[PDB]
Ligand code: NA
């Protein structure tokens with residue numbers, strides 16, 4: 498999930514935008 | 519929506535919790 | 540902190556604090 | 569601001585800034 502991808506690993510714009518509605 | 523209920527009017531815990539997963 | 544006008548980042552912050560490990564959805568405008 | 573470790577309120581803030589008027593969903597743990 499987002500924590501694994503952005504908190505415990507380095508986040509990316511690419512990944513963040515997957516959580517926009 | 520949440521903006522109408524919590525931003526342009528006064529928010530409540532009751533309303534906020536409706537947006538928790 | 541919840542019983543006031545909450546806009547933008549202030550509203551997101553309140554959702555974060557209230558919802559905790561549940562998470563939340565923020566859908567505006 | 570997005571290319572780093574982002575946790576908790578820091579992550580919510582990044583979602584808020586990136587997603588803008590779209591809004592977002594935050595589902596952790
Ligand atoms: Na609290």
Ligand code: NA
Pocket residue numbers: 585
């Ligand atoms: Na920006």
